[PDB]
Structures are given as C-alpha cells and as structure tokens.
Amino acid sequence: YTKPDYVDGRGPYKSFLKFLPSIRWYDPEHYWTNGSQNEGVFKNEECVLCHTVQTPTIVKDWKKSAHGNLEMRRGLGVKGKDGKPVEGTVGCDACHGNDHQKLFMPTYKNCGECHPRETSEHRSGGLGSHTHAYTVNVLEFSWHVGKPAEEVAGCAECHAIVENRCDGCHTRHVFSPAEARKPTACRYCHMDEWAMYNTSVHGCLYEAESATMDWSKPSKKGNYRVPTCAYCHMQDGNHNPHKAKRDAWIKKCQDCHSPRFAADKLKEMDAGVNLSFTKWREAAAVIVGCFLDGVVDPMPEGSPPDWYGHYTFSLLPGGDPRFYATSNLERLGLEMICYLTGNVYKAYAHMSMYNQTYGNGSAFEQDRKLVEIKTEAAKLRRFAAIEKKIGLEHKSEGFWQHGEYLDLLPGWIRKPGDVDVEWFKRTDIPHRANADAGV
Amino acid sequence: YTKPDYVDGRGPYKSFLKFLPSIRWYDPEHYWTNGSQNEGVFKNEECVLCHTVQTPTIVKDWKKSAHGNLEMRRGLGVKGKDGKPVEGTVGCDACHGNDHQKLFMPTYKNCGECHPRETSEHRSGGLGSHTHAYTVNVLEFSWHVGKPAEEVAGCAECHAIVENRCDGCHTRHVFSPAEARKPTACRYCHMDEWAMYNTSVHGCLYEAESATMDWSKPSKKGNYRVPTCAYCHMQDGNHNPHKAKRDAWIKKCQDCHSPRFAADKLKEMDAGVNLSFTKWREAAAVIVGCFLDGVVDPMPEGSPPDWYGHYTFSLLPGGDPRFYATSNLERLGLEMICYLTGNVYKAYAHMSMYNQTYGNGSAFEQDRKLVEIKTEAAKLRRFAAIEKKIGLEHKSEGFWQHGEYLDLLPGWIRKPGDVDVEWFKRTDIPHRANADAGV
Amino acid sequence: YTKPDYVDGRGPYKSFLKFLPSIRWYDPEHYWTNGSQNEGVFKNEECVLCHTVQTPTIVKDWKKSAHGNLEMRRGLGVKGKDGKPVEGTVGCDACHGNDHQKLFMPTYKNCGECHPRETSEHRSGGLGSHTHAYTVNVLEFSWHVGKPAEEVAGCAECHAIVENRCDGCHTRHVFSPAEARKPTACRYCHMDEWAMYNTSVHGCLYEAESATMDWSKPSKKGNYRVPTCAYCHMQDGNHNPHKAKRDAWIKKCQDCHSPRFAADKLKEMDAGVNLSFTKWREAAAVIVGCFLDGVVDPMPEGSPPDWYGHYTFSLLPGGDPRFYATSNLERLGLEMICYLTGNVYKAYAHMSMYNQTYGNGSAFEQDRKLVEIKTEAAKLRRFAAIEKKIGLEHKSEGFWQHGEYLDLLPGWIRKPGDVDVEWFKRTDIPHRANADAGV
C-alpha cells in the first residue's frame, strides 16, 4: 500500500484531515485551480461550436436548456447581478468565464446572481438539511474524519453536491424542473428512504404513470395525482425542506386524502416508532450491561483508539458509536440504533407496509438483531464464567488492536491542541455535538 | 413507553388481540364510525365541486374514471343493485353516501351491487389467496396475534386491502385496468416475488417497453408481448388466482413459447426445489439434534412462552416457528425454511436465473445459512462439553426471558378458555392449523 | 430425495459432470434432439399462419421485426451465406428449418451467415468476456462442477445465452437494437453491477428520461445524453467489450465530460480499491493465521473433500475458495474477497456514491465483515486455549463432514485419471487456472 496524493483539510480537524484532489469539483470556492491546456479569451459563440466537437453532450444539453434556448422560456423575468433583466442567452462564459486559463467552477453564489429566491431558500435551512451537509455533516462528522480520505471520498462528494452547487436535482446542463420533480433526482443520495418509497403504493404509481403523466406542471395542489419526493418536501416549489408541524403535514396530505385518514396514518408512525424504541432499550441494557462486568472482547483498551483519541466505549456518552475498529457487540448495537431504528421511522413515514415489518431495516429485523446481540452477550458471559473457574487470565487478541488498515486510522495521531475550536465557536453555522468540540 | 389507544379484536383470539383505531379504513364493515365535522345531505354535484377545493386529486381522478366520465366508457352494460342498467354517472354519493354524518366506507359488497362477476370470482378463492388474507391469514396468524398491534399494523393493513376493499390493483379514484395490469400494482404487497420477476428477463422487458406498449388491451392471448403479474395469474381477466395444473401452465406459456420449452422450464423448478429440501433436511437434523442433547441456549423454558402460552421448541410440532423471542439456532432455522426455502421456489417459478443461485434467498444463501446453523450448533456443543468436564452448572441468561419488549408479549397472559373455537368451527371459511385451535 | 434425469457433461470434467435435459435450448450444437409431435415440410407462409393460432406472440414479434417486416428496414445490405444479398423476408424456415422432424435451434453460427461482423467481433473476446462464458467459465468453473446440475442449472443457462445464441441483449423475436441499448437488456445477468449503476446518477437519469428520449439512434458520440451499459462498453456498436486503456476511457467520458473530470474520477477508483485491499490483507492474515495454529473448526480433514478431491484449506493456493461445505471462518473470508472486494471495484467504476460507502458490498460492509472475521477468529482461539488447559481433546463435529446434501457432492467420487487435460491443452480457447488442470 502507498498513500495517494492528499490536499489539506478545511474543517475544525484540518490539522490531520486530508482530501483527494478531486475535491476541486466539489468545493470550487476552496480547492479549484486551473488545469486546462487550452488558452485564449473567447466569445460565447466560440465556446459552443468548439465544444460541439470536443464535448458534444454539454452543448446538446445547453441547447435543450432555457439558458441556451430562448424559445424554451416561460418569461420568468430573471434579473442577474445588476438590476437590469436578462433577455439575451445565458452562455458558457456566463457560468464558467471567458478566459480558459482563468476558468471558475460555479456554486450557489454564482447562481444567486440570477436566481436570488432559490438561493435564499437554500441557505435558510438548519442542521441536518441540504444547507449544512458539507460544512458541518462532513467536516465535523465522525465517520468521515475518522477514516482516510480515499475511503470516504464519496461521502464528501455526495454531501457537497447538494450544498455547494445547484445541479443536484437539476441534471447539469439541462436544468429541467420536470427532471428535478422525479424521485430519481433524489434517490441517488437518499438510499434508506428510496426503499420505503418504492415498496409503498405512492412509488408504485410513479413507475406506472411516469411515462404518461405531465411533468411540466409545478408541484402544487391538484397538479399531480402521484406524490413524489419534490411534492412532499419541496412544497409549492420551496427550496427548503409538535401540533403545528403535524397539522402542516395533514393539510399537505389533504391534497389527495381525508384529514382523518392523514391523521390516522401519522398516528401509526408515532405508535410504530414507540415500540421500536423498547427494542433498543432491551439491546442497550444488554450491551452496556456487559461493559459493567467487563466481559466484552475486546475492551476499549484492547481496541484501537477512536477518532477523538481515547480508549472509550462506543455506545456510551463521550465515545464514538461506530461499526468499524470495535467489538462485535458494539457493532451490532450501532447497527440497530443508526440503521434499523432510523429506517423504521422512514418506513412508517413513507407509508411502506412491507418495510414496516418484513423489509430491510424493519421491526422484524430489529427482532433478528436483538437475538444477534443477546447471543453475542451470552457468548461473552459463558466464556468469562468458564475462564474464571479454571483460573485463566484471558487477554484480547492482537489483531483487534493492530492491522494494516487499523494503523492508517487517525486515532493514533490525535494530540492535545489539534482541534480548531474557533470553527465550533461560529454563530453563522450550526454544529455537531462532539467530545473534543471545546464549546 | 406508554400503550397507544386500542380497539378490541375480532378473530378467534379476540379476548387479548387488539387493533389500532386506523383499522376503520381497512375493516369498514366492523370498525367504521363517523368522524366528520361537516354535516348535511347533498347531491352528487354538490359533493364534487366542494371537494375540488378541499381534496382536488380525488375529483380530478373521478373525472378521469369511467364512473365520473361517461365519454370514458366501453359500454359494458353494468346493472347495479336493481335489474335496471346504469346509464348515469356513478358519483361520490353512490359509493360513500348522501349524508356526511352517515358516511359509509365501501367494501367488495358495495362494489358487488354493480359488478357481480368480479366479486363472485373474488370470493371463490381458498386458503392462501386474496379471499382469506385478513379473515384467516391475520386473525389466526401466529406472528400477528403474537405481537402488539402497532408493530403488526402494516400486516393488518396490507392483507386487508386486497380482501375487504377493491382498490388493491385499482388505484382508488381512477380504477384503471391498464394501471392494474402493471406489475407495480402488485409488488407493494408482493415483496420475495418482485425481486425474482425483476431479475428475470420478463421483468426486464417490462421496464424496457412499458412506456411504448399498449396497456389498454385486456390480458389475453396475443394481446401482450411481455408477461406481467396480471397476465400469468389473472388469466383472461379472471379475478381468482398435478398433471392437470401443470398442463394448464404450459398452455398459458404456449402464448409466447414452445410447450416443450415450457415443460423443460417447469421441470427445472421441480428439480431445483428437490435439492433445496435436502439442505433443509440437513439443517433440521442439526437443530433438532441439539434439542435432544439439551445444549440449546436458551432452552424453551429459559425463553419467554410462545403466543400459544407454552414453553415449547419452535421448530417442532405444537410449537410456533419464529424469528423473535427465541434462541439463535431456532432463529437461523426459521430463516431458512420460511424465507429461503420459499424464495427458491419463487426464483425457479418466475424464471430468475440470478436469484436461483446468487440472489437474495437463494440456493447459495441456503449454503451460507447451513454453515451459520452448523457453526451455532458447534458453538453450543463445545460449550456444554467444556462445562461438563470442569463441573459447572450453566443456566440461561436473564435477558433472554425478560425485557421491556418481551414483557409486552401476549404469551404471558394466555389462560385456558380464551380461544373462541366456534370461529374455528366455521365451514364457510378455511382455517389455519394451530395448536390451540380446538378442532 | 431422488436424482433427476441427467445427460452427460461436455467439459474437461465430463466423466462426472452432468446436465439437466433443458440444456438443449442452451447448447443446441451439442444437446439438441427433435421432440416435436407435428410433421411435414412447410413453406414460410405455412409456418406463420399456423403459429399465429398456436404461439401468437412469436408471430406478432416477427411482424414487428426487420426479418419479417420489409418496411421496418434501414437497407443495411445484408449478404447471407452466399455472396448474393438478402432482399426477401427472413422467415421461420430461414432460422429453424423447413421440416418439423428436423428442426434446428440457432446459434452464433446460424446468425453468422447473414451477420459476419457482429459474429466476428463476438468471437474476438478473451477470458472473462461473453466469448468464453459457457465453454470456459462454466465447464471449468469451480462452483458449477463442484455442485449437482439442478442447483447450478441457472448458472449454465445464464452464461450460455450470451455465448452460444444471440438473443441476449436482443429480445428473441423482435431483435430491436433500441431494446438492446437499454440497461434492462443487461442487468438480468449483471446483478453486483446493476446496483452500482442504479444508485449512481447515470442510472437515475435513465429512469427519468427513458420514456422521452430517442432510442432509435446508435450508441455514438452526441447521440445520447444518458450513458447506458451498451454506450460505455459496446463503443460505437462494437460487439466486443495501463495508460493506453485509461486514456481510452477518458476519451469515451469526454463525450459528456471534461477529460480532467474524467481523469480525477478514475483516479478515485485507483485510490478506493487500494484501501479496500488493505482490509483484505488484514482478513487474510487472520484466517491463514488461524490455520497455522490449527484452531479452525472444522479443519479441512474434518470437512468434506473439495471438488478437486483433496482435504485442503479453501483460502490457500491449490485449494478451492468456497462459501459451501466449509468452516465459518473460511466462508466469511471468501465472502469478502469474491463479493465485497469485487463490488467495491464496481462501485467506484460506475460512479456510485452510496455503494462506495454505505451500499451492498461496500467499504463500510468490508469493515463489518472484518469484525465478523475477527470475532470468529477470537472465538476459535478462546476455545482452543480453554481446552488445552483443562486437558480436553476436541474433535470436529460429524454434521460438518456428512449430510444429505454433502453426500451428493462430487468431491467423494474424484479418482486419479478422470480429468481430460487435452481439453486444457487447447490453444483456440483460454483456460481457467485449476489445481488438477495438468498444464
């Protein structure tokens, strides 16, 4: 194994966090440098008919877009950068630049010149939304910072497409709202939301009607028979995704349904999640219970240190819950709470009858995982008992602590004074709760 | 944890079986009560243009239906309730009623007034079909009655849509046969039938042609190139799904294929299932073999009592085969026979080449599960051996028997004389074979 | 259990290898015999209008094909068998024959009369391609020969459709290139390539546009916005799927993308696979490490003999890596290298962001499997330690070695001098590296 080329990180853990050079297409404001052979300052017309030979699809798309094709316009009345409206064609130079040796890759800031509302709404969201997916939910996230860059390359890419740039639900060089309204524009990131929507009758009607139904109309009351990702969350074309919030859902459901039917189905979600929590309470008592007696193989000391730089239990306040570089009991615990408990919430919400019970990450799988946890707990307790009686001092195996991949973990290189807590002190952005956060 | 609002059960175990209030939309004959704020007796025209503002999609659908749009009719010659035919529009009041304080939710009985044939054929099916999915395969089913209502909410809902009401394969307010013919109208319930159909070339041709092919024609000989769920099982529009039954399939396959090709492929199914049974015979001998020696942790007594109310082995006559609240050896056993052995049958039948071998619930996974069972058996036998020699009396752990979810199980509250066996004594409906059935 | 009817094998292990009679539709050159009731020599016109009643779909397809419908032709200038071009209709007798008692089932040889280029390109491929999928990757393959015929029926069928006959990507009786261009024509065999393509944005755009986009155009530069299976691998309609090979991909990607973007994404693939290998190096050291100490339950001698006929370790040169009829430690090892390590390569290549990390057969699952391997290793080492101290001689269990399915394995009947090494000596076809290969 040889270490690939790395560029320096950007988050609060930037002292040791690294990125692959490909990050330039994902954080253009921060990592973009010129790398074009071609030179010269060109007019838009020169850009198009030179790229028709070189990169034909972009041009073909651009001609299928409102930016490039004036006939394909609805007279929105867009006013870009200056007050004056845009009547001419929005070309390649408008988005990328005129000089080839000074090309810039566009973000939400570049789009914000022409489209203020869609950008303002995009920046209005808080923690967990599209607004803070890269800045917070990548740079401060445990599994991303706790792993080498090439492993979590897709993690940085996926979370950054929706935050930084605008071509998430919009193809790239067509920017069609009809394409954006489709569930396909959402599921390549949301994958276990897609499985719930697919196994529900809402998703089934999509596949049945998508070829026939009119996609040109905006996601508004009456306009659509089949609900999509964009219809439910991006209400009336809004670019931002407990009685006040519940009645808001019932009113949206009242587009096609009775409010009584809407209320009953959302009450099913409450009752379904409540019973799934009791399954977790059983598991948590078992796993933590094994830690009290110290029968867990291996113990946190016998394992490699976590990304914080401590030898702490994963499923315990302070420690980092993980699936990697930990004991099997801790792995099966994290598997239940993160994946399975979260997916049951998604199953009841998206009205998936199968995934509520029999499906992937379901209540029946929660029962299966509960057995897996209990059997693991039974195994460790039987071993310890036998060892105690015969008079054997068992020590955790060497392969738990050290390995070719395990040595590459950043947990070994964590030293006091490497955290930039001034990043955490920021008021403009929300923050993830971490042990070494400072604040 | 707090217990949600429950309404009383209906099956033979109605003494302890409960349901969520949402069951009213699924068993309207039995659980529907009025819950509308709005009052007054209205004409159909008043119903439509008041609901256009409130619930627009229903109205838009109703106008896209033959019931609401007379232009969209094929002159079937429907004769509803009375002998006289229906020439006028079938409105909202025809299905739901005139008074808002006295609204009724329609079943197969309400549809049976106008459509006698489709209802008669629907009621003609026996055990395991759509006919007895809720009455028998929910109220008498082990995993449904053996679990709290909010967990198995979707179980009651899914099985009841196809039995009680008619909007299973038919959207709801469009009732399009073209939509019903599509596999999407079937797979939201049938999910592992869908995976087999999808990974087969039959399902692949569906996705390739669905946008282009004519869906308006009935499922008859010649009419379709690509076979669907509705084409194979609902032959010639029949609303009801060994040489006599085999030749019946070959003749149906002869619509597109050679009978020799049809016979060879169905012979593959016979040979494929035969070899999958020998894998089960190996597993069964191992799991039951561990019960003879009493090495299973935990033993039925160490586990919580089953839904019947006994401390019996799961994979043994009398006992209830389950994945929950049992030992790992018993869980892996049930996983193989119910899911994997059943799915192999589905894989060979639906001509899925991948799912016959490499797929989910396949022959190769049966091999994987066989190892999982054998390793579990090896673990228990090695433990017992060591314990015996050193002189240790091992008792099953406490977390097996008792837990927050485990205490909520109905197995603890089973008392003699709670079974309504007069339900089981019925001649009009088939019955599931249970231990405490009485007959 | 009773053994189904078997026909003799054909590969180098033909002494014990068997096939189901259904192989006649898959190896027609080798296994096809007449089995038709109907007799007589007929003209093409007699074939069509007799099969319109009997097998209507074939006829309807044939009329929708260029072979049967002259109007549906692009004037290719096909010249069949003789030099003279084909102007008349290519009928049923042209493909199958005139006499019913002397019908032949077509291969690539039968198609090669009319279409020389598409056949020549089909035969140009080497090991691992469509060219040698049945002859080499079935008859010489370990899991196929090491299992009874009815279990690996689909294995023979799937691998033979693409090699022997031509109706793989082409329906059967339509032979539409538009249908062949679609990913659906590929994924029924390629299933974990499909999951990677589906979860990527390339596959998402397919489902979004397939109903609208023009499929009639050939897979060429500019012609398509959305890349498919056929677009990427079958470049410019070529019927054959490190700087020289890398730049070839970048140029193909340059159809829609910047070469810098193309280079960066393929560099991500290199770095992603490199880190996945270190996870394997950890696993391999652990599993083989357990074999040195002899703590593996069961040991190769305690297991049934492999398909070669030896009692060797699976994950060791000479031995056969398998998931069946082996220890759990060996199973989990094979699961990682074959499925998971191979799927990570597929995930990075097909630009799937989800399947790079969280998906099925991913880097995060590699971490999960690494724990599973380590826990299994920990279990075996703890057992052996306890046994040694107390003075117990542990022997592997009987159910590992013998069973109803295990007895049916060909490993028991392997005798010296059963291998046809003259098959392996062939120069016209590449060969799989086996222990008993001879050369």
Ligand code: HEC
């Ligand atoms: C900055 C990053 C963004 C800009 C600028 C725009 N978008 Fe979007 N977008 C999305 C959807 C689903 C729609 C269709 C809404 C509907 O149902 O009607 C749109 C639409 C637009 C429009 C058209 C609005 C109009 O009134 O004409 C514009 C001008 C537009 N978008 C610009 C989806 C998404 C999305 C989800 C993943 C993101 C991140 C963005 N859009 C971001 C931007």
Ligand code: HEC
């Ligand atoms: C009571 C519960 C039901 C009534 C009343 C009807 N159906 Fe269905 N249905 C289904 C399919 C797949 C079709 C299309 C059949 C074809 O291929 O041609 C239909 C069609 C009908 C029709 C039209 C028949 C005609 O000759 O015009 C009527 C009037 C009709 N259905 C009424 C599917 C299903 C289904 C599967 C899930 C169920 C449960 C029902 N239908 C139930 C009813």
Ligand code: HEC
């Ligand atoms: C022998 C086994 C084969 C013959 C003879 C032909 N094919 Fe194919 N084929 C495939 C695709 C994806 C296409 C479309 C290519 C495109 O994008 O334009 C085709 C096309 C043809 C054509 C038309 C070529 C023309 O210039 O008109 C012919 C005559 C043809 N094929 C004959 C895919 C495949 C495939 C993949 C699974 C296989 C095995 C074959 N084709 C095999 C044959």
Ligand code: HEC
């Ligand atoms: C013909 C001589 C061209 C003209 C005029 C313009 N572009 Fe170009 N561009 C051209 C080629 C052959 C390439 C690929 C090789 C390379 O230099 O990278 C490109 C590349 C781009 C890129 C990607 C550059 C990168 O950093 O990866 C962009 C963003 C781009 N081109 C845009 C662009 C614009 C906006 C132009 C008009 C002013 C323009 N190009 C002119 C060929 C030619």
Ligand code: HEC
């Ligand atoms: C990939 C680039 C995405 C696309 C396209 C869409 N979404 Fe997304 N979404 C994505 C990420 C990485 C995140 C952040 C996850 C986190 O919690 O850190 C989100 C967030 C959401 C949310 C908010 C979830 C919450 O805070 O509770 C919603 C409601 C949501 N996404 C829905 C959604 C819809 C409807 C989309 C289609 C238009 C969509 N997303 C696109 C990744 C991506």
Ligand code: HEC
């Ligand atoms: C793109 C295909 C993804 C990859 C790669 C990863 N993430 Fe993601 N993220 C994705 C979605 C759309 C969602 C679901 C959001 C929802 O509302 O449930 C998420 C979810 C996770 C969460 C976990 C939970 C929570 O605590 O909020 C976070 C914040 C997050 N994602 C982190 C993250 C990182 C950086 C990844 C690599 C280690 C990981 N994601 C993969 C899909 C995208």
Ligand code: HEC
């Ligand atoms: C306007 C005043 C209305 C007229 C006239 C009719 N309906 Fe209605 N309906 C209306 C509203 C605002 C609501 C939702 C609030 C509520 O009372 O539940 C409804 C609801 C229904 C329902 C669902 C009732 C339930 O139990 O959940 C049904 C089945 C229904 N409406 C049907 C219906 C019919 C058949 C009518 C004609 C006689 C009719 N409604 C008239 C508003 C109005």
Ligand code: HEC
């Ligand atoms: C959900 C509401 C369903 C829809 C829509 C369809 N089916 Fe179904 N089917 C469903 C259930 C709950 C059951 C009973 C399961 C049991 O065994 O208890 C069935 C049953 C069948 C059967 C009979 C199986 C047997 O007895 O061997 C068949 C053949 C079947 N279903 C096929 C089928 C088809 C082709 C459908 C589309 C028109 C369809 N079902 C719709 C649930 C649901």
Ligand code: HEC
């Ligand atoms: C709707 C999405 C479903 C949910 C929820 C559950 N069931 Fe179901 N059932 C479904 C289908 C369509 C099938 C397959 C039928 C086939 O022919 O194989 C079934 C299968 C099960 C069976 C198991 C086997 C047999 O013994 O017949 C039964 C009878 C049954 N279903 C019971 C049942 C209950 C009540 C559920 C919750 C505990 C369970 N189902 C979930 C899909 C639908």
Ligand code: HEC
């Ligand atoms: C009517 C009398 C027919 C004429 C004339 C032809 N075929 Fe036929 N064919 C017919 C039937 C009723 C059947 C099914 C019963 C059977 O004999 O198998 C067939 C079958 C075929 C088959 C499949 C045979 C097999 O081995 O499975 C083929 C390949 C076939 N038919 C082709 C064919 C051709 C090319 C003809 C023209 C010369 C022809 N058939 C004439 C009925 C009749």
Ligand code: HEC
């Ligand atoms: C089923 C009949 C298949 C269809 C249809 C397609 N492919 Fe395939 N492919 C199939 C097999 C059985 C194999 C051999 C697997 C082996 O390694 O033994 C292949 C091989 C390929 C390859 C070569 C892989 C390699 O050697 O590295 C490629 C690139 C490939 N297949 C792609 C591919 C595409 C793009 C297809 C659509 C046109 C396609 N295949 C069809 C099985 C089948």
Ligand code: HEC
């Ligand atoms: C059709 C649905 C399949 C079945 C059944 C099996 N095989 Fe296959 N094969 C399939 C594909 C398209 C691929 C992927 C090719 C790629 O490039 O990755 C394969 C892969 C395997 C390989 C494994 C790896 C390698 O060493 O090349 C081989 C050679 C192979 N296939 C063997 C084989 C046999 C005979 C099967 C039964 C035991 C098995 N395949 C199932 C899909 C098709």
Ligand code: HEC
């Ligand atoms: C109907 C309206 C829909 C549809 C068609 C989809 N979703 Fe959602 N979704 C919906 C609800 C009512 C909820 C629950 C919200 C609540 O009451 O708490 C959700 C939930 C989600 C979530 C989880 C976010 C959270 O924690 O609150 C996500 C990420 C999400 N939905 C995304 C999503 C996607 C991608 C969809 C398309 C496939 C989709 N949803 C469909 C309502 C509806």
Ligand code: HEC
């Ligand atoms: C874009 C171009 C695509 C698309 C749309 C698909 N694939 Fe591929 N594929 C592509 C690349 C660049 C690679 C890696 C090749 C390399 O550099 O080594 C692959 C890889 C495969 C493989 C593995 C073959 C190998 O070992 O090299 C297979 C079997 C394969 N692809 C098939 C495949 C199928 C069936 C697709 C449709 C769903 C598909 N690909 C999409 C490039 C691209």
